[PDB]
């Protein structure tokens, strides 16, 4: 498997590379190999801290690093064929950076935010400044420490430098703000305990869970405006799904109460309910994978209250003023385009020429994960205003879920001056609904 921590993969990378290849002059090659190796290690650990490290869990295997080594070899060999030294400025930094960001480590990258964050790291590392003795590979920890790039010119020094790395590694080496472990190990430790601790009626079960659901989910009541049509469609879907699921659950209750009715579909539904798994028949709006029936019922209660409020307000048109919950809707991209169309009609611009501005349409419920501020100066959301207008900032995603699986809503926020914008991509910032 890929190893744990940066040091392990760095040592394995040096082991894999034959000494007869890396040793050949110009000496610059050796340093660049180390640089490449270091970068690979960060990637090889960022995957372990998804989704913050990478929104999509791409694989970066042996062949990627092998093609990387071939690319570096080709570039340096053709740069100064026959010489014994290349100046720091004469390395084709931009060329290798492009071949890195687009093909080798970007070939499997699809979401442009990840492709943006690969280019950010490549700009951070592959530069002339790498050959400066004061160059820092990254920040070591929050306590005012930095990993100083080794000043040697041989693997016989770089390998030793890698061995002498500190034991107390944290994700801050990777640019993440040392929080994945706070869940990851926090699970594994408990799992560890369980492992050594492992080394040394259907109807009643369903009825206990289904008795109180009717007291949880309330009951819903049902011209050419771009806003009033979409919300009518959405509340129609809400009422349909509400009646379907509630009828199914009540029929399961009657089965448990003893009024026969044990049909095939009801039998399967009971078998799924007792296990606590979400019935696949009800997956009419995207949810986190493996979500439980209890979480589903809570989300359904909240959605029912949301749609009840929406119907009561719309009946009273006024959908520019009535609040919304992005992500709380079933197809929020439809709502976003509905706002686009409403602004286009209300003042008679064309839709293609519009673009969004945001600040703190009134939409609530969002939360900025990986940053915080109160003046549109993001630093490394009780109410939000959105507007559409014709024609030191960071382009962020906004995902419906808490697993960063579905890009739904792109935003451009303004960062505070003292923060490098690059740090906003290494920190894996985004907004969740």
């Amino acid at each position: 498997e890929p190893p744990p921590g940066v040091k392990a993969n760095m040592l394995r990378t040096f082991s894999s590379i034959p000494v007869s290849r890396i040793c050949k002059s110009p000496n610059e090659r050796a340093r660049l190999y180390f640089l490449l190796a270091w970068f690979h290690a960060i990637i090889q650990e960022r995957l372990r801290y998804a989704p913050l490290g990478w929104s999509k869990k791409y694989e970066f295997g042996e062949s990627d690093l092998r093609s990387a080594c071939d690319t570096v070899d080709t570039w340096l060999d053709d740069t100064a064929k026959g010489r014994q030294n290349i100046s720091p400025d004469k390395i084709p930094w931009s060329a290798l950076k492009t071949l890195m960001a687009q093909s080798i480590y970007g070939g499997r990258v699809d979401n442009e935010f990840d492709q943006r964050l690969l280019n950010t790291f490549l700009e951070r590392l592959f530069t002339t400044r790498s050959f400066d003795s004061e160059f820092k590979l990254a920040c070591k920890v929050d306590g005012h420490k930095d990993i100083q790039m080794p000043d040697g010119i041989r693997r016989e020094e770089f390998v030793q430098w890698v061995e002498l790395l500190p034991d107390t590694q944290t994700p801050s080496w990777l640019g993440l703000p040392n929080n994945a472990e706070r869940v990851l190990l926090t699970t594994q430790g408990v799992d560890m305990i369980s492992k050594m601790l492992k080394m040394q009626t259907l109807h009643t079960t369903a009825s206990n869970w289904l008795h109180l659901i009717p007291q949880t989910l309330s009951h819903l009541k049902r011209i050419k405006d771009p806003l009033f049509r979409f919300f009518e469609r959405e509340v129609k879907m809400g009422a349909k799904l509400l009646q379907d699921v509630r009828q199914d659950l009540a029929d399961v209750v009657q089965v448990c109460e003893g009024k026969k009715k044990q049909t095939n579909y009801l039998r399967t539904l009971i078998n799924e309910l007792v296990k606590g798994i979400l019935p696949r028949s009800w997956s009419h709006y995207t949810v986190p994978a493996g979500m439980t029936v209890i979480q589903w019922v809570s989300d359904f209660s909240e959605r029912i209250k949301q749609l009840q409020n929406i119907s009561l307000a719309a009946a009273s048109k006024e959908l520019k003023n009535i609040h919304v919950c992005l992500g709380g809707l079933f197809v929020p991209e439809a709502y976003i385009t509905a706002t686009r169309q409403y602004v286009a009609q209300a003042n008679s611009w064309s839709l293609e020429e519009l673009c969004l501005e945001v600040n703190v349409f009134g939409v609530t419920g969002l939360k900025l994960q990986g940053a915080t501020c109160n003046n549109n100066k993001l630093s490394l959301l009780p109410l939000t205003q959105l507007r559409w207008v014709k024609q030191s900032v960071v382009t962020l995603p906004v995902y419906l879920n808490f697993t960063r699986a579905d890009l739904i809503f792109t935003v451009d926020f303004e960062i505070a001056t003292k923060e490098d914008p690059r740090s906003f991509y290494e920190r894996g910032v985004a907004v969740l609904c």
């Binding site: 492009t98 990258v109 197809v331 064309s350």
Partner: protein, 829 residues
């Protein structure tokens, strides 16, 4: 003596074996073409009186290649010496302007294709030059110029195959000079450039390239386009389970012997066995040719010589239901690349300028966000596509509508209405009724004003009137009882002109079979061309039966259903090619057989065989699928073909009632005769019921309020009612035959048929339910009906037979209380 080009751009040899001949001819022609195009390269202002002649003198691939070579030479020379770069930009801009003005006027055949090709090529060249100029480059050999597809020519090169060379980022290829044909040129977008970069890397590394991502984003198209850009003939194979380890080995043997480019559509259903064996084979050949670069290879336990020009390419669509994972030892042998969003705005801009629209930039910048808005807005149906395929189809529709309007009339033609007319042609049909109010309104907010009203082929309308009256079907013209259905028929006629491949979709009882039948017959009448159809049920036979099978021990491919129908078609011994020939599929969807068609419902309409035999669809052929719903279809299936949504309201209740009455009146049960006479009489009796609300529609709609043991569908129970009323007529016929001197008169037949029809509705509708539900339908029938009914206060209406005298009789008259034999108390029967 020459080459008979399919398109018409013929080729004549310089010395009138074959492969060398065509290569030499194309190479010498290319040398002459570049020697001629350097004039326009250096010309300050280009006169069309020489430019169009130069275009006409040579072929599409040749003229594009010559323009590319000259532009690359000019840019490299300008960088070697921002004055000269601005001069090259001005030259290419002038060429683009004269070409874009030339395309406005009509042109002979085989030329406008070349003009479109050169429009695409020149806008690509201008884009590269402008990007280079803005990010100013002073060094000739900087990477930002080295990384683009550069072309070099040296006439000093004695042998006539190697003068042209292509150079890319750390790469040097030689153009194939194999005859590629016209086809079409793809717009150069950033992701196509990324594909070229990585594919070139892999080819220099003796590997293969593996584009992947959502289906329908130019993976196979990018592969084949780059193959054309290197002069290498591209073979696309329709991979699926039918391909065993020996078949793929034979394919690799052929590839290595000929040195062609092996394009593969979907490495996701070869099964792990024939996937791992292929992994072994590709690793073997890759290592062999790596040794060659610094040879014979053991293909299927046979040493075969292998050319350096061969290559492997693996398209895939990971993430979909009908797909399988891969071994890692295979995946390490292919340089992967993810494609998810080809830049549509630039594509639309270049295509519209290729057609020559006045405001092509504005049309593209409007049409692309229109697609995005509509995709984000409309309901999440199971067959809505708005991806790249829909954009290409609507753009080609816009081009054809421009041509039609020009022929109707020239330089002041409105073009927004053309776009609206194309969108309504190809995008409106797939919509559900609830999605009509949104989409049109969206078109109001992307194209304000420019209101459009559809034409009409009234000749087809009258022919449809004639056949629809012939087949005892009701006919309308847009708003009458027969309006919606015939309107959908004209919609299908419009769609079959574009999408060679189509899906009629909707719930059962919509009229899809009737729709395409009436359209085939009407087109046959209108154009006087035999409209021939072949109906196939996919699941009713095995997939192997559907497509056929290869014996494992010799070359004998037993044809299946679809393959045999095709082989008969392209054989055309009976002049089948001179007939409107349709293959109609009727069943349900399963990827296991659907995605084997993915290479014949797509721009490159062609499927392959395990033997390597290739079958293309002739132009007249159309493929059509009649389907209920699309619950189990990948995005590829939806994107491959156009849609027609036959909602449940395409046939009103009165429509089927009138069809039943017409069939009753016209054709007899045995084929005014006696049977016909009683049929017409009975139709007269029940005429106030088989129409509008009446009683039959009321009962039919009431039937869906009651519980059933199976799914109540309107058309099932209504066919039941029709059949048992046919039996009512047969009963009257038997009664008349029973009295050869006292035939039934109107005063008896009226009572008989009225009571029979009431009983028929009441039973046929509630034909499968519990006793209480049948009683409930009886109560409904009592409430609505006008016929007299039994006066028993508590006997259900279902408990009465209709006497041949036309009088109700309780069933208790037919249940004798008998005493069976003691010999046979409970014996069988």
């Amino acid at each position: 003596l020459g080459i008979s080009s399919r398109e018409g751009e013929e080729v004549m040899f310089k010395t009138p074996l074959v492969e060398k001949e065509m290569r030499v001819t194309l190479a010498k022609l290319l040398a002459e073409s570049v020697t001629e195009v350097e004039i326009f390269g250096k010309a300050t202002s280009i006169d069309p009186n020489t430019y169009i002649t130069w275009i006409d003198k040579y072929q599409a691939q040749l003229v594009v290649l010559s323009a590319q070579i000259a532009w690359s030479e000019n840019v490299e020379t300008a960088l070697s010496s921002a004055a000269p770069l601005h001069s090259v930009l001005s030259n290419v801009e002038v060429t683009l302007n004269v070409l874009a003005d030339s395309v406005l006027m009509e042109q002979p055949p085989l030329r406008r294709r070349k003009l479109e090709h050169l429009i695409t090529e020149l806008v690509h060249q201008r884009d590269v030059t402008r990007s280079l100029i803005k990010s100013k480059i002073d060094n000739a050999k900087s990477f930002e110029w080295l990384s683009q597809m550069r072309f070099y020519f040296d006439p000093k090169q004695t042998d006539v195959l190697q003068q042209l060379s292509i150079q890319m980022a750390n790469a040097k290829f030689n153009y194939g000079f194999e005859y590629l044909g016209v086809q079409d040129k793809l717009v150069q977008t950033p992701l196509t450039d990324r594909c070229y970069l990585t594919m070139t890397q892999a080819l220099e590394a003796r590997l293969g390239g593996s584009p992947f991502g959502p289906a329908g984003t130019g993976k196979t198209e990018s592969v084949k386009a780059l193959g054309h850009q290197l002069g290498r003939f591209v073979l696309v194979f329709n991979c699926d389970e039918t391909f065993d380890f020996q078949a793929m080995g034979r394919i690799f043997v052929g590839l290595c012997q000929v040195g062609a480019w092996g394009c593969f559509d979907e490495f996701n259903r070869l099964e792990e066995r024939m996937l791992s064996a292929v992994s072994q084979q590709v690793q073997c050949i890759q290592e062999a040719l790596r040794e060659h670069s610094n040879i014979t290879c053991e293909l299927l336990n046979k040493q075969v010589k292998v050319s350096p020009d061969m290559a492997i390419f693996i398209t895939m669509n990971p993430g979909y239901a009908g797909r399988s994972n891969l071994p890692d030892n295979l995946k390490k042998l292919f340089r992967s690349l993810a494609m998810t969003k080809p830049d549509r705005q630039l594509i639309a801009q270049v295509m519209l300028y290729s057609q020559g629209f006045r405001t092509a930039e504005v049309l593209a910048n409007k049409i692309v966000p229109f697609f995005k808005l509509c995709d984000e807005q409309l309901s999440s149906q199971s067959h809505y596509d708005f991806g790249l395929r829909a954009l290409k189809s609507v753009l080609v529709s816009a081009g054809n509508v421009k041509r039609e309007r020009i022929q109707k009339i020239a330089e002041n033609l409105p073009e927004q209405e053309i776009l609206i007319q194309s969108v309504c042609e190809t995008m409106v049909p797939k919509l559900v009724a609830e999605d009509i109010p949104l989409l049109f309104s969206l078109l109001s907010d992307v194209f304000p004003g420019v209101q459009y009203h559809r034409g009409e082929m009234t000749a087809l309308r009258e022919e449809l009137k004639k056949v629809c009256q012939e087949m005892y079907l009701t006919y309308g013209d847009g708003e009458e009882v027969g309006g919606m259905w015939v309107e959908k028929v004209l919609q299908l006629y419009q769609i079959t002109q574009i999408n060679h491949g189509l899906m009629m979709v909707g719930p059962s009882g919509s009229g899809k079979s009737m729709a395409w039948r009436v359209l085939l017959k009407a087109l046959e009448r209108l154009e006087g061309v035999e409209g021939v159809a072949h109906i196939i049920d996919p699941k009713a036979i095995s997939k192997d039966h559907l497509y056929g099978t290869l014996d494992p021990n010799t070359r004998e491919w037993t044809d299946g259903l679809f393959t045999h129908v095709l082989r008969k078609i392209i054989d055309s011994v009976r002049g089948e090619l001179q007939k409107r020939q349709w293959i109609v599929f009727d069943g349900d969807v399963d990827p296991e057989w659907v995605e084997n068609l993915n290479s014949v419902l797509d721009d490159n309409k062609l499927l392959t065989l395990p033997n390597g035999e290739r079958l293309s669809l002739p132009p007249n052929v159309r493929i059509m699928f009649e389907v209920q719903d699309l619950k189990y279809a990948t995005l590829a299936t939806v994107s491959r073909c156009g849609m027609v949504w036959f909602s449940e309201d395409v046939l009103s209740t009165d429509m089927i009632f009138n069809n039943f009455l017409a069939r009753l009146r016209s054709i007899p049960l045995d084929e005014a005769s006696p049977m016909l006479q009683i049929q017409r009489d009975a139709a007269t009796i029940m005429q106030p019921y088989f129409t509008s609300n009446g009683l039959v529609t009321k009962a039919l709609e009431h039937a869906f309020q009651l519980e059933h043991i199976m799914d109540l569908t309107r058309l099932r129970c209504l066919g039941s009612l029709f059949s048992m009323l046919h039996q009512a007529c047969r009963n009257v016929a038997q009664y008349n035959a029973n009295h050869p001197d006292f035939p039934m008169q109107i005063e008896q037949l009226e009572r008989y048929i009225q009571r029979y029809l009431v009983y028929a509705i009441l039973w046929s509708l509630s034909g499968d339910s519990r006793l209480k539900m049948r009683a409930e339908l009886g109560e409904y029938i009592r409430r609505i009906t006008t016929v007299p009914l039994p006066t028993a206060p508590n006997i259900p209406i279902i408990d009465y037979e209709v006497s041949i005298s036309g009088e109700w009789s309780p069933w208790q008259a037919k249940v004798p209380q008998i005493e069976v034999e003691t010999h046979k108390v409970a014996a069988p029967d």
